[PDB]
Design a binder for this molecule. Structure first.
Ligand SMILES: [Cu+2]
Length: 99
């Protein structure tokens, strides 16, 4: 599943921002507009026992170039909340459910 980082109208949003996947299904987060961006899973809003570092950028890491991606497949079932650190208060957040 492809997820745009920044909308095609320049809005600081993940597109889509809420979605569901199965285990092992690729997520490709792709810089689109308004970059740099990143994608950080909130350590306190992911499934039991999951290591956020296996699946996340750090808050310091950035995708700097249009078209640059961060790819992650999730395994464990449950809800995962994530955000773009520099744009979180602007609303650049999302939630993926693995079922
Ligand atoms: Cu951002």
């Amino acid at each position: 599943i492809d997820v745009l980082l920044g909308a095609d109208d320049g809005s600081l949003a993940f597109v889509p921002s809420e979605f569901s996947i199965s285990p092992g299904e690729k997520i490709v987060f792709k810089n689109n507009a308004g970059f740099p961006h990143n994608i950080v899973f909130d350590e306190d809003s992911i499934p039991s026992g999951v290591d956020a570092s296996k699946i996340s950028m750090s808050e310091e890491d950035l995708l700097n170039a249009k078209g640059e991606t961060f790819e992650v497949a999730l395994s464990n079932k449950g809800e995962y909340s994530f955000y773009c650190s520099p744009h979180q208060g602007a609303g650049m957040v999302g939630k993926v459910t693995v079922n």
